[PDB]
Design an enzyme around this catalytic site. Structure first.
Site, PDB file in Angstrom:
ATOM      1  N   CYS A 119       0.805  -1.340  -0.134  1.00  0.00           N
ATOM      2  CA  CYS A 119      -0.095   0.012   0.209  1.00  0.00           C
ATOM      3  C   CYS A 119       0.769   1.203   0.050  1.00  0.00           C
ATOM      4  O   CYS A 119       1.504   1.530   1.111  1.00  0.00           O
ATOM      5  CB  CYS A 119      -0.906   0.027   1.049  1.00  0.00           C
ATOM      6  SG  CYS A 119      -1.778  -1.445   1.198  1.00  0.00           S
ATOM      7  N   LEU A 120       0.901   1.843  -1.143  1.00  0.00           N
ATOM      8  CA  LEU A 120       1.731   3.011  -1.544  1.00  0.00           C
ATOM      9  C   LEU A 120       0.831   3.800  -2.251  1.00  0.00           C
ATOM     10  O   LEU A 120       0.706   3.091  -3.496  1.00  0.00           O
ATOM     11  CB  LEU A 120       3.304   2.926  -1.704  1.00  0.00           C
ATOM     12  CG  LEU A 120       4.267   2.564  -0.870  1.00  0.00           C
ATOM     13  CD1 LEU A 120       5.716   2.644  -1.510  1.00  0.00           C
ATOM     14  CD2 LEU A 120       4.119   3.488   0.345  1.00  0.00           C
TER      15      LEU A 120
END
Length: 279
Positions: A119-120
């Site tokens: 998750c970026l």
């Protein structure tokens, strides 16, 4: 020939690649020219702590290896991500599948999910973190990889969770950051174990050279053993010693000691086999 080359194109994607069974898409006419620019940036600017392998037969698949930086719970441990560039790359972000060798214990970082999701914002999977959103004209695989090393594998990863940032400095955030780092440290040691026990396609010789020839397995073992002594000395204490403040992982619980020593048996067994083969 070099034992630790930052970027290489290998002949064949490995059979253990996360996306090995997804057949390659056609891609646009501009795709190959874009990959030429991407490769040039990897070769020019990857740090020594990030290896990337591309493949002659699968121009859509890549594998990367990031070494955990110094004074983080991740220090000296290997973090592998398998990548796919879909038919719409670079319009669309690269697809990351992180190899979470966590054995059901939970995540090693709030942004690295046990099913493989990273998750970026720069991967198009999260809205509004300090990594910038993906776009073909600004972004690159290189920038994605240094964002993982620089923004994910950090000293106090518990605050990678947006809710908890408001608690820095507070009595509870300090305690919870130490508890988190103890667990991430013990789990990361298991990543060294997994990377060496099960040969990783296209990265076998690099990992052996890093951990055996260049001595980093000795360092991992020595650091862990020193931490077991210091943790035994301070097991009761209500506060950590002054010199051990600013340490990412200042001490372990009794259960963390046991967990760590389980992993040390396997890590020492790997060193022992290597020492045998040299006689």
């Amino acid at each position: 020939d070099p034992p630790w080359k930052r970027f290489e194109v290998l002949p064949s994607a490995p059979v253990d690649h996360a996306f090995y069974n997804t057949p390659p898409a056609q891609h646009t006419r501009q795709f190959m020219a874009r990959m030429s620019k991407e490769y040039k940036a990897l070769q020019s600017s990857l740090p020594d702590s990030i290896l990337v392998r591309a493949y002659e037969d699968r121009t859509d698949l890549l594998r990367s290896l990031i070494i955990g930086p110094e004074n983080t719970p991740y220090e000296d441990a290997p973090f592998v991500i398998d990548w796919m560039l879909d038919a719409n790359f670079p319009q669309t972000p690269p697809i990351a599948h992180f190899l979470s060798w966590t054995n059901g214990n939970g995540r090693v970082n709030p942004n690295l999910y046990e099913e493989g999701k990273v998750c970026l914002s720069i991967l198009g999977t999260w809205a509004g973190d300090k990594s910038e959103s993906w776009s073909a004209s600004r972004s690159s695989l290189l920038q994605a990889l240094v964002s993982i090393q620089g923004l994910v594998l950090v000293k106090e990863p518990w605050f990678c969770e947006p809710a908890y940032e408001k608690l820095r400095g507070t009595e509870d955030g300090i305690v919870n950051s130490r508890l988190y780092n103890e667990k991430a440290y013990v789990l990361s040691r298991g990543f060294v174990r997994r990377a060496l026990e099960i040969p990783l396609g296209g990265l076998e010789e690099e990992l052996r050279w890093f951990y055996h020839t260049s001595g980093k397995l000795r360092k991992v073992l020595g650091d862990a053993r020193a931490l077991i002594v210091k943790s035994t000395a301070t097991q009761g204490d209500a506060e950590v010693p002054e010199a051990d403040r600013e340490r990412a992982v200042p001490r372990l619980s009794s259960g963390g000691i046991i967990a760590l020593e389980r992993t040390l048996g396997k890590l020492q067994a790997l060193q022992d086999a290597q020492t045998a083969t040299e006689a």
